[PDB]
Structure formats: C-alpha cells, structure tokens
Design a protein around this ligand. Structure first.
Ligand SMILES: NC(=O)C1=CN([C@@H]2O[C@H](COP(=O)(O)OP(=O)(O)OC[C@H]3O[C@@H](n4cnc5c(N)ncnc54)[C@H](OP(=O)(O)O)[C@@H]3O)[C@@H](O)[C@H]2O)C=CC1
Ligand SMILES: [Mg+2]
Ligand SMILES: [Mg+2]
Ligand SMILES: [Mg+2]
Ligand SMILES: [Mg+2]
Ligand SMILES: [Mg+2]
Ligand SMILES: [Mg+2]
Ligand SMILES: [Mg+2]
Ligand SMILES: [Mg+2]
Lengths: 489, 489, 489, 489
C-alpha cells in the first residue's frame, strides 16, 4: 500500500496539485439528475452522513444507510438517527450489492477498514465516494479498477450543511475524480450531481483533485489552523502571566481573543482585521508579523515539505500502529499546560479590548496565515485551494477554542489534525522563545495609544496588507460567495 | 470675438473635452532637439517665464526675453531677473520678428492685449505658445492662420518646476495643439520639445487639448480648490465660534487644518486622509460627506454647466469690462469676515488634532473633491484631467491659506479663480446653513472617540472610499509619478 | 412641442447618450412579477403588438388590446388576430381607463395621434410604454406628469420575438425609463418586468435610455444599414454593367451578395467576413475600405451631426407635413434605377463567388459599419449601443434586399429609415463617382487570384481588422448571447 | 558529482523551474557599470566568446582571452581572431589569477574539464559566468563556495549578437544566479552588467534560473526543434516518394519547406503560418495537428519526464563515457537515409508552393510546437521560457536544414541536442507510420483547393489557433521586442 502521491513523477504531481477551478453556476444545469433513479448508499450515519443524506433526499435522491450489524443490534446513535428520520437502514450485505453510489462517510482514520470490507460487496461499475482524500492519496488505498472514485467535500460541518440547505442555500464545496478510477468517464457527472444534491452549487463549487485537497488541508491544519492557534495560545498566555497580568484575565483574553479577531477576518480578510486596530497599533502589528514570518518560514517550509514527501503521513501512521503513543503523550502534556488549567476571569472584556490587548495575536494570525498560503503556493498548490484551507477555516477553529480551549479544539478535529498540530506546536513554542523575550509594551496585554503616524508609512503598510495575494483571492472569493448568497435570497 | 467652444457642435466639443492621454517615455526620444538652433522668445519674465526659461536654456535652447520698453526703461523686476541670470533682453520690435517660438507667459487676464500686440511682429510660420488656454477657448482669440498655436502647461508653480529640473527630475505637464492653427502639422513636435526642455517628460506628460485644459481648470478652481476652501473656512470658523470654541483657537484650527489634512491627501489621496481618522470618526466623516454631496450636487452641476456653456466666462468678462465691480465688492466683503479678522492663537495644535477636530473639514474635502471630479467626468472630461485639476492641486491651495488666510489665497490665484471662488462661495455658504445647524458633537472641534465599530460597515466604507474613480486614477497616476522620480534621482 | 434632446444641456445630453449597460441575469430574479395582477393594455395589434402580447400572456400577464372603434367594426386584421388568439379586445374608452400599463405598439410616425388620444383616458399614476423612443426624443411629446414612461425595445422583428420565446429562449432587448416621467420611481421595475415577460432576459437586456436608443438607431439606419446598402447596390450594379458584365448576372450578384457576405458578418463580425476572402483579396478589400472611410467620413459625420442637432428629424417632419413629397419623389426615382428594373440571371452563383466577385461590396460593408460605429462613439454613444444599431442589424436588412431588392427594403423599414436612407444615398452615390471610376480588375465582378502575400503585411492587416473596437465589443457581445442561448438549451 | 536538480525537493525544484520574469528597462539604469574597472577574462574565443567580447569592449569593459598554451603555440583560429581584433591574449596562468569575472564560453560537453582546470587559478571572491546551465544543473559541477556563479544566455547565435549590437540594438537574453554560489549577494549585479554590456537590455532580458534554462532548452531541442524536424523530414520525404513524387523534387520540398513555413512562424507565430494557407487547407492542417498531438503526447511527456528526472542526461553521459557509441551509430544511420542521400532538384519551387504542398509539415510544426510548450508548462516551466526554447528558435534550426539537410543540423547543434534528437526521432518515426499510411490527397505534396468553408467552423478554428497559450504569449513577447527595436534604431 504505497503512498499514491509518491508513485507520481513531478509533472504528474503538479497536474493534480494545481487543480482548482471555481465552477460556473451554469455547469450545474442538470442538477442532481444524473443520480435520479439510482441507489445511493451512505456508509455510517454521523455528522456529514446524516446531513448530506437529508439534503440529498430532499433533492430527490434515493438514500439509504448501511451500518455494521452490531450498530443495528446495539441501536447506536447512527441507527436511531437514520430510522427516526425515516431513512431505509440495513447491513452492508443487504444494501451495498445493489448500490450505484456508495458514499464513505466514516472517520478518515477508519477508511482502510471500511473500504476493504465494502469493495468486495460492490457490483461491477458502481461508484465509491469520499468527502476527504487521505485514504486515496496518503494511504494509497487501491480501488478495484471497474469502480469510479469521486470526492465531494463540503467546507462546513454537517449541521451548517443541512441548515444552509433548508433555507434554500448551501455551503462551498470541492469536487474531484480520481484519475486511476474513472473507467466509464462518468466521474465528473456523478460528483457534480452529488454536489448539487447537497446544495453546494448554490454557494460555489471548486473543481479540484484528491491530491490538492489532501495536501492543502494537511498544511493548513498543521500550521495556521491548529498548530499556530495552540502555539500562540500557550506563548501568549505564558507571556501575559510572566509580565504580571492576572492569570484568570490572561486566560479569558486568550480563550476569546482568537474568536473575536478572526470574526473581522471572516468578514473582510487580514485587511479588516488589521483595520480594527488604531494606526500606531496597526503599524506595530504589521512589523511583528514580518518578524514572525521571517523566524517561522523554515518551520512552515519543513511542514509543507514533509507533507509533500509523504514523510508526514508515514510518520503519523507509524504512531497509529503503535497505539497513538505520541498523540496521547502530547495530548496529555497539552492538558497539563498553565493555559489549559488556568481559572477564567469573571468580569467583562469588551470587543475592542481583544483587538487592542491582542496586537501580537493579530500579528500571529497574519504571519501564520500568509506563511501557510505562500508555502502552499510555492509547492504547486493554487491560490484558491490555499485560501480555502487556511484563512477561510480560521474563524471556525477559533470558535472551538472559545467554547472549551485547546481541549475542545483537539477533540473536535481529526486525529490527523491533532497529531499535525502537536508536531508543529512543540517545535514552534521553543522556536519563538527569544522572540517572546524581546516583546515591547503594547505588543500584548495593553493597548497601543491611538495617535499620529507618518503618512507615507501608513499608506505603505495599508497597501502591503491589502495587496497580499491572499487578500486578493480572498476579496474575490468572498465576493463570489456573497453574490451567490444574495441570489438565493 | 466669439467664444471658441461655442462655435463647435457636440461631436466636436466631445473630441476636445475628452483629450487626455498619459504619454509614453519613448515619445520623447528626441527630447528638446526639435527646437535646437531655433529662436525662442518668452514674453514677460515672471514666475513661469523665468523658471521655464532657466530649464530650457539648461536643455540647450536659445532663450531670450521680450519686455515692454517701459519695463526695460524702469528696470522692472522682470528686466532685473532676466539680466541677473544672463539672458538676452529686448523690446518686442527687437526680438519678436525673428522668433521661431513666442511663448506668452503673462497673466491670463492680459492675454488679449499681449497677443494682439505681438502677432503683427511675428514672422511667417512662427509659433505661439501658451501655458493656459483661456485666451483661445473662452475669449475666442483669433490667431493668424500661418501661426502654429501650442500649449505647454506645467502642473506646479514656477519655483518648483525649476528645482525639480535641477534635481534631474521635473513636473507633470499638459500639452496641446490648437487644431485651427497647425498649418505645418508641426504643433505636436514643437509642444513636445518645449515640454521636454522644461523637464516634463522626466515626470509625466499628458496629451490633452486647449478646451479640456480650460474647462477642467475653471471647474476645479471654482468648486473644490478655492470656492470650497473659502466656503468651508467661513462655515467652519463661524460654527466653532457659535458653539463656544475660543475664537483665536478656532481661527488657527481653520487656518492650518486644510494644509494638514491635505498633506495626507497629497501622499495618498482621500483614502489616506480618511485612514488618519479613528474608525468611528471615519464612519462619521464618510456619512457627512455623502450628505454634503447630496446637498451640493445641484450647485456643482450649475458651475460646470455655466463653464461649459460660456455663461461663466462671459459673465465674468462683463465684470472685467465694468472695472471688476463684483470682484472687488466680493473681495471686500470677504475681508470683513469673522475668520479673516479673527485674532490668531499662537499656541500649539498637534498634527493629529487637526484631523480629529476637523472631521467636517475632512468630509468637505472628500465631498467637494469627488463631486467636482464626478461632475467633470459627466461632462465629457477624462478622469486624468479631472484628477489633475482637483485633488492634485488642493494641497498647494491649502498651503496659501496656512500662510495668510483667505486673503493670501485670493491674491495668489488669478482674477478668474478669485471671481470663480466668490461666485461659488457666496452661494454655497447660505446653502449649507441648515446643514451646519444640525451638526452633532464630534463633527467639528472635538475628537470622536476611537472604539469598536461594526465589521461589515467598516469594510464597506473602506471599500467605498478606495473604489471611487478619483481614488483609482489617483493611485495609478501617483504610481507612474513615483516610479519616474525613482529613475530620475 | 420642442425637440426634447435640444432642451438638454451638454452634460445632460451626454448622461443619456452614454447610457448602456448589459445587465446581469441576476437582475431579473423577480421575472414578470411586478406586473402580475395588473391590467396591461396594448394599443394596436400589429407585428410587435401581437407577438409581445402572446409572450406576455404566456408569462402570466393580463393582456388586452385596445383598438379604434372602426378597427373593430371593420374587422381589421388586428381585431381578427387578437380575437382568434383569444385575447380580450375593446375600445380605448372601455380598456384604457383601468390600465396599469398602456403599451403603444403603433407605427412611430403615428405616435403623436395615438398618445394624444390615449393620455386623457389614462388614470392617475398609470404607465405608458414605447418600443422606440422617437416620439419622446425627437417629437418631444409631453407626457402628463403623473404618468410613468418606459421603453422595452426588442432587437428583432415580432415573429422572431414570438418564435424564440416559444422555444424557451428570447431576443436581445433594450430598456429605458424617461427621467421626466418616473414620479413613483417604479420605471425600472415596470420595464424589467415587461422585458422579462417578453423573454428578453433570457437573451440579454441592455439598460439604456430613450435618447441613446433613438440617436443610435437613426445613425445606423441612415448610414450603414439602409443608406450604404442602397448607395452600394446602385454604384456596384452600375459599375458592373458599365464594365461589360451581363446585366442580369450583375443584378443577381448584387441582390444576393450583401446577404451572403453579411451571413459571415453575423457569425463572426468583420473578422470572419474578411477571412472568407483569399489573402491577396483580403489585402485589397482592406485597402479599399480604408480609402472609402477617408472619402465618406465627412458625410457620416454630417449625418451624425444633423441627427444630434435635431436638424435631421426637423427636416424630415417638415416633409411629413408636406405630404411626404420628398420621400415619394426619392422612392419613385429609386424604383426607376437600372438595378431596380434589371432582369435577374437564372443560373447558379456559388456562395464563394459572392465573396470573390464582391471584394468592393465587402470593403463597403467594413468601411460603412466602422465609420458608423466610430462616428457614434465620437458623439457620446457607448460601444454596445453603436454595435447593436449597426453591425448587429446588418444581416436582417441584407435579407430584405435578397428577398425583393431595394423596393423590399424601403417598404419593410419605417418612413423614418427610408427618408434617412434617401438623404444619405443621394449624397453618397455622387460622392463615390471618382472612386468608382478608378477601380482595378478584381475589385468587383472578378476574383482576385489567391496566392502569396508578404508575411508582415498579412499579419498587420489581420491585426488591424480584429483589433477594431467594433470587432472587440462584437466578439464579446456575441459571446454573451451565445452563452445565454446555450443555457436556454 | 550528483545531478543538482535531483538534490532538491519539489518545492525547491518548482521555485527554480518557474523563474522567468521579463525585466523592466529601468532595472538596467546602471548599464554595464558594475563591471567597469574590473578584469573580465573569457575562456575560449569561439562564436559566442568573440562576439560577446566585441560587444563588452565596445560597452567599455576590460576584456581579455584566456587560451590553452597549445592553442597559442599552434596559432589556432581562436588565437588568430582575438589578436586580429586587438584583444590581449594569454594562458590561464597569466590571466585567470587576477580575473574578477571568468566567462566560460567553451562547448558544453567540455565544461567539466574547463571548470576543473580554471577554478584553482581563480582568486578569492571571483565570479564564474556560463551561457548555458548544463554543467551546473545536470552534471552537478561543484563550484568553490567563495565563487559567485552567474549565467548570461543570449537567445541568438554570436554573429547576430554582434551585428544587432552594432545597430544600437541587441538580442533577447536570459540571466540567472546560482543560489548555491552567491556569497556576496552580487550575482544579479554581475549578471545584469554582463548582459547590458552585450546589449541584451536593448532588446529584452528575462530573469530566470540555471534550472529553468536547462530543462526547457533540453525539451525544446529534442522534441520540436530537432527531433520533430528530423522525424518530420524523413517521414515526409518517404511519403512523397512512396506516393509518386519525383525524388529530387521531394527532397527540395522538404529541404527548403521548413525554412519557408517557419519564416511566417517567425513573423507572426502559428497564427500567421496557418493564415498563409487557403481556408480549406487551414481547416485540414488544424485537424491533422490535433490528430498528431493526440498520437505524440505520450512521447513528448516521456521526454520531459526523463529530462526532469535526470534519466535523460545520465543516459546521455553514459554514452559520452562509452565513446559516443549510440550517437555515432544514430548519426551514421541518419546519413544512409533516403532523404539525406537523395538528389536535389535544381528547378523552381515558388514560395506559396511550400505552404500549399506542405500541409502536413505545417501541421507537424503546430502540433510539435504546442505539445512541447504544453508539456513544459505542465512541468512547472513558465510560458515565457517555454516560448523561447521552442517557437522562438525554430526558424533558425529550419535554416540549417535549408543549407545542408539533416547533416548540417546535426553538426551545427551540440552533441546534447543531436543525441536528444536521435533519441526522439527514432521513436517518433515508427510511432507515426500508421498515421502516414492514412493520409488523404492534399495532406502532403499537392495543394488543397481554396474554396468555401462553413462560417462557424472557420471562426472556431481561427479562434482555437490564436487563443492557444503559446500564441498569446508569443504575440506579447514579439510586441515588447518590436517596440524595443523601434526605440533602438
Ligand atoms: N418592426 C420591428 O422590427 C420593430 C419595431 N419596434 C417598434 O414597435 C412599434 C410598433 O411597430 P410595428 O409592430 O411594426 O407596428 P405595426 O405597423 O405592425 O402596427 C399596426 C397597428 O398599429 C395601429 N395603428 C396605426 N396607426 C394608428 C393610429 N393612427 N392610431 C391608432 N392605431 C394605429 C393599427 O391599427 P389598425 O388595426 O386599426 O389598422 C395596427 O393595429 C414601433 O414603434 C416600432 O418602432 C421595435 C423593435 C423592432
Ligand atoms: Mg481544511
Ligand atoms: Mg480537515
Ligand atoms: Mg487648475
Ligand atoms: Mg490655474
Ligand atoms: Mg436600429
Ligand atoms: Mg429602427
Ligand atoms: Mg534552446
Ligand atoms: Mg542550445
């Protein structure tokens, strides 16, 4: 079971790495029709499985859920959810053999066990679907030649997928067809119909590839999404305490800061997030970010490089086979950090206060997101892909920390993201120690007084921020999506 | 002699009004060589005359000054300056008859008397140069058919055209050829060489026309440049005083405020000027500006329309023929004004304070500048011309007020600009009275406190500011010009 | 009843002349809804009236036809067509008083008589609709203040309007709202709904103005569409005969040539039409076109100028009031020309033969269409407008000539177009006499031998053709429309 | 010494492969001044060496030639040429030790022996220049760390770089700095001054890299430039003969056909080359080209992949070490070929006849050029590089065949290009056998008659031709270069 990406030569790798194309609304004229009157069987009934299923049934598709025998006998939540929503439910043996499309909506770490049990039961020329590409790409799962393999990957959790669909809208979605498995050349038609049936074509669909989705997803989560938020949380909390800030106040500042500042990010990219600062604070935030980018570039590059080479996934899967020893160890250490155990301040912290007292947090967001984006683009990944696996997802991850700290983040995300996070975090914390030691008053925990700044410098900083390539694609893609949302009224 | 613009039909008017083309560097490969070995004679040795002459001689041209006999006999400053700097000086009869190029650098109000005295002395196929097109366009001066008529109009005062040249640089420059007077088709060759001899091709040269230059200049100066600064100065000082501001402090606020805020405008357009405010102050300046634009639009449109139709210049020239009765009456009334007679505070007003306490002033600049620009573009004038006759020139006019108040502005500018100012200002002041009566705290004379603002609103305001056509063309032009500067130095 | 365009000042004229905006498909989300449950009454039941009505009824609107009392009593075709299609039919008195939208679909020359009879019967706040703007713009018809005046103008004859609608598609359409008559500000909503109900939003809708539609329509028909085709037909037929070509063969060459060559024009603009020639023939066609453009420019300019000034329509309406004396005289002379009376060749003329024997015809098409376009754009009209009133309409007019010669063209088109045609034709024929006298072998009636040409010249000619502004907007607009058609499948 | 490209990971490879930036004129403001007062020593006085040296001395640089002692003693042409032209000439020991810049202008196959002999003589911090990057990239030559390593690669033969310079012009030029050897960060300064001293900045200079230059050069030469011309020459001559064409006439058709059709390619890209055909012939060349591309794509991709992986150059260098056994065997077999031994017709073949009777040849140029370009761009090479190593260079290679057939091409080009050619050609010939067997009349050796073609099809073919990425970038680059020429002359 060799890593699939590694069986490809440079030209072949680039061809897939660079696959990303925001699709025309027109391209989905046939809607879900191609799948009408065919048997669609979802494996598992979890977050994505139930919610994609609800949407697809509403779109006219025949959906049923294949569960393990013991899931049915034990009345697992999956079986209860499926049956209470009036779906047909059965065993692999009763449902897989007739299925035209088998949709694998189980946790990624489990995909080998699932695919290997399900394939032999699938009829000739049936299609196998994934919502994430790790199994095909990193594991190198071999799919029987006559089977068509496709991906439809919503960029939101299942509940949002269902909710947006109900209100006549939907969620941005990525699609792909695995070229080793498109024997009848119907991959795209199946994927487009599946995507349309979940409502994706209402919000924007990107034609991509298993390889691009996987490589960019891993880079984003390891560096900016989880790695940086964890490293940043520990560094900043420790620094605040070390400089005399009340621990409970420091813990709340950090717990809710990322969420507050990334909400400006969600609304208008790095540009708006920086704009919420006073002018002198913006200039300082910009400079801190530049120093951060310079210090962290080799680390971000190492991560992209290991992701590309297969060294990342190979190393992690060795931990999987050794009972997640390293994961569990790092998770335990994480749960013992001062920030994770700190008491939480009780009084109010005003919205602007998170910005003004979090100059360094803003700079860490900017530096990490730009570095992740640049390093991906430098590795053959297209801007749009890099954007969706970095800046786009940041606010949601910030939300989890707000809910229940690093603990909540690390249980909400996949084992792959968690492991990825620790690998980065435990390198990045030591790395930034000298840097943290030289912070200046105003950098963290105290507002930098608004006031006069040099006209030229202000102009140059504003221009440097908004002209960053991630701000340009961001402004464009958010523009598309806003337009789509408006149309759906 | 009839207004020249009015002898043209719509198509012909449009062809002229819309002439404006930023010229390529390579169009000046010949430099000043077309004028080498030729006799260039400048009439009147004043601000433009001496300084353009200095540059042209340094560029290898043969430059002499033709003065009136009494100017020589009385040793006027013009005669002093020319002979001091080692130029040949003579009477019209001595120098004009052999002139290949006669450059008229006397005040615009005097052009008819100058042109009608110099024409009969000019040899066959000579050329007549202007640096402003009022005499040709509005007066309708008729120029002997064998004479070629061209314009080279630096966009900066004489002292600056000299010092930039000495620095190996130059000043943005407009050129034009009057199509009724180009019998050899050599107008453009003459104009380009004259412009290059002054150093304009080192900065940027625009191919324009007598008509576009005049109509846009008149509109910029009477609305945004002088009218709005005069109307705004009076309105704001009176309102500061009315609401309890110490008069001497109010007068300093207004006297130096325009210069301080437009320094930002100079460096980075309306964008940078607004960026200097706190976020809540910015949102409020933007709103005030929109209200202002709505209220002033009919007045601005009236001024453009009267400029287009010739009603403005005919009305003004009737005043010329009536011993400037209206001009002088308006000038006197301006001198008895509260702002013009107020004591001046000698104490300190910090740079940021002019922005923070001048929210309404900033809104007036934005509104006036945008409105003038829009109204011009709606009248067949190209963006670049509209930009150069409004936003570009505003910082210099603000500097005059900083020096010696409205008195200084009205004596520094031409009688045409001054009359235009009053005509506008005396209508705009009463027009805005209800508006001033409804100002809220923070609008003028007191800072609006920095703080939180809605994310979306801030994003949208920032986008609306920088996406304005005057901001887009301004960012482009300042770009070209900044690039050229780096080459030259 | 003063010409409306002439009551406007330059800025006001340009604002309307330049109104042209291909609209977003999204802008028509409400479809015909705004008119649902309102009373729509069409006046007349002719070509546009019946076919727009059929479409609008199918779209859910309440359509009825108001006829003159005697049209009903005499059982005119209008009454028969309306009733056989099951429409409600009545007198002005019975239908107008309750109408929410009265749609004037009578011949333009008749509009004063119609509007003046219908207005007094229209309730307060009702809307009056036109499909052509001549009445409002040139005649200056005054519409009661409370009435909303809008235009919806399909760019195809009624039958095509109905036919394209039936097959789920439609026809490119122009809309406008007369600013003197939009008291409730509902003009655009009414016009958009009317346009959508006829199917226009399926093919492309342009937001324009009465003034732009009228001025560009008149220029197109007078010069390239009818004027040039008539002048060209007479010049070429006479030249062929004069040089020995069999008259019957010459008459067929000319009768069917325009149609054949403009079919390439319809498919791919001037670019494709020229591409159908051999290389040497293309180079010659290009050169002839350049000479033509130079000879004809003053004439095309005169026509645009008279159209703009109101001199065209004023002069024509003086003929109207003098019983169309000049029209009838020119029409009679036209019917006596050699081409109009020539016998028609019986044998076959191959498709390529029309191209190869019609080098001069191709050059006349190119020169006339480019000149009409350039002259319109020079007069404040937007490219898209100029395109739709010139190149776009050429093939249809070529078709009429093919059917039944100049006679057919001049009876198919409005009296306004016919008069316009003669005014141009009778100037253009004499004008081109010297030019026709110097034609070379191959220019007309004989193929120019295919073969070698200079590489550079060929490149330059190809580039000069396809880079013409009319070829750029053409390629773009045909691209939009093709896309729209594809979507409608 | 290991292949340098292979020591890099994907990200690092991509950074190099994708380096290509057309440089601004202003980047060369300093001209050659960075090298003034320095000692420049060229090793080997051959085609590039003498001619670059002539330009550099004229540009004010201090140029001397370092020859082997035996070259001086034996009075080789190199020694003759240098002393004839008045240059200092010495041994390595005399000139190298004080050299600031040692420019290696010996044949690429000899670079290892040259570099390893010259390095030990070079003083500390000296610079080593190449004009092709094979030694650094593929051989992996290791250069003393204190030595700066740069490349200046004119895109034209030496005689042309000399004569363009004399004309005040120059030749498009690639520059690069090897990142493993830039200890003072002065590489770019050295490279830019050397390029300017040769006159490259007068035409156009691209900032590229050793890696991009090598990989693209190798790919262009073995597929389109030499391989395709050799495979095409043999295939076409044999098919002409097989089908009854007189052999001597067939050999002239092929010998001079490539040069004649690529003259059009030189002047205006594939666009102009296709335009020279009749419409029906054009449609057929286009179709043949598409079929060819489909058939050859795996072969082209194989060549790129082997070039990327190092398999090509390692395979070739094993042949170098085996006394060029494969090269010589392929060379000999090429000489016994029917085309190479055919008699030559002395009679006339008209220019247009090479196009008309060479439809297949034109299709082969189109297909090969596009395929090579596409395959390179798919491999991380930028369009501009891909353009300059294929289409740009094709006319010159065609000229060699016109002179003395495949014999002349294979002796004029390097051993690397020749070996690359054979490796490709001997696979492509048998590959295309079934294709040649199914040719239709008109495909080769006889004109396809001009005539009518479907309008839409012609439009679409013309669009597909000119919209190809190689045509778009080609039109842009030839534009820049044409503009620069006009300035210089
Ligand atoms: N034709 C075209 O290609 C296009 C035309 N248009 C516009 O559409 C409008 C209608 O044109 P079209 O359909 O050709 O018109 P028609 O010639 O087909 O109109 C026929 C109808 O108009 C009625 N009519 C004529 N004169 C009067 C009058 N004096 N009073 C009352 N009714 C009268 C006739 O009444 P009755 O039945 O009693 O005889 C008849 O019912 C025009 O403004 C035209 O410019 C717009 C786009 C394309
Ligand atoms: Mg992700
Ligand atoms: Mg993920
Ligand atoms: Mg001015
Ligand atoms: Mg002025
Ligand atoms: Mg028309
Ligand atoms: Mg018409
Ligand atoms: Mg090459
Ligand atoms: Mg080479």
């Amino acid at each position: 079971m060799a890593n699939y990406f590694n069986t490809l030569n440079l030209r072949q790798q680039l061809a897939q790495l660079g696959k990303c194309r925001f699709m025309g609304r027109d391209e989905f004229a046939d809607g879900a029709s191609y799948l009408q009157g065919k048997k669609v069987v979802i494996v598992g009934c979890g977050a994505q499985g139930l919610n994609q299923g609800l949407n697809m049934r509403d779109s006219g598709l025949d959906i049923s859920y294949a569960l393990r025998k013991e899931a049915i006998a034990e009345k697992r939540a999956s079986w209860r959810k499926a049956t209470e929503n009036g779906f047909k439910v059965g065993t692999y043996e009763e449902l897989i053999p007739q299925a035209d499309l088998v949709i694998n909506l189980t946790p990624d770490k489990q995909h080998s066990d699932v695919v290997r049990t399900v394939q032999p039961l699938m009829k000739d020329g049936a299609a196998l679907g994934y919502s994430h590409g790790f199994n095909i790409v990193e594991v190198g799962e071999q799919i029987r030649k006559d089977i068509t393999v496709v991906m439809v990957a919503p960029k939101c959790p299942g509940t949002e997928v269902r909710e947006e669909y109900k209100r006549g809208f939907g969620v941005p979605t990525l699609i792909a067809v695995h070229p080793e498995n498109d024997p009848k050349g119907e991959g795209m038609a199946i994927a487009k119909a599946w995507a349309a049936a979940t409502g994706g074509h209402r919000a924007g669909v990107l034609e991509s590839s298993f390889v691009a989705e996987v490589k960019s997803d891993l880079m984003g989560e390891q560096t900016i999404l989880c790695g940086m938020l964890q490293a940043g949380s520990l560094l900043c909390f420790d620094k605040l305490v070390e400089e005399g800030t009340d621990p409970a106040y420091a813990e709340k500042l950090i717990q809710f800061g990322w969420e507050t500042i990334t909400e400006a990010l969600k609304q208008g990219g790095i540009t708006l997030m920086m704009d919420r600062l006073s002018n002198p604070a913006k200039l300082r935030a910009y400079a801190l970010s530049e120093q951060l980018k310079e210090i962290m570039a080799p680390l971000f590059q190492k991560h992209m490089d290991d992701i590309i080479s297969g060294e990342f996934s190979s190393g992690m899967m060795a931990d999987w086979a050794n009972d997640d020893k390293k994961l569990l160890t790092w998770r335990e250490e994480t749960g013992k950090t001062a920030f994770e155990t700190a008491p939480q301040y009780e009084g109010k912290i005003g919205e602007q206060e998170y910005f003004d007292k979090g100059v360094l947090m803003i700079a860490m967001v900017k530096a990490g997101v730009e570095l992740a984006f640049e390093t991906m683009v430098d590795s053959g990944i297209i801007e749009e892909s890099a954007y969706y696996e970095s800046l786009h997802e940041l606010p949601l991850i910030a939300n989890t920390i707000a809910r229940k700290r690093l603990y909540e983040m690390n249980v909400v995300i996949s084992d792959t993201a968690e492991y990825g996070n620790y690998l980065f975090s435990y390198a990045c914390v030591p790395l930034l120690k000298p840097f943290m030691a030289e912070l200046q008053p105003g950098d963290l925990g105290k507002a930098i007084p608004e006031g006069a700044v040099d006209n030229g410098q202000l102009r140059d900083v504003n221009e440097a921020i908004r002209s960053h390539a991630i701000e340009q694609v961001g402004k464009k893609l958010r523009g598309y999506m806003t337009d789509m949302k408006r149309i759906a009224v």
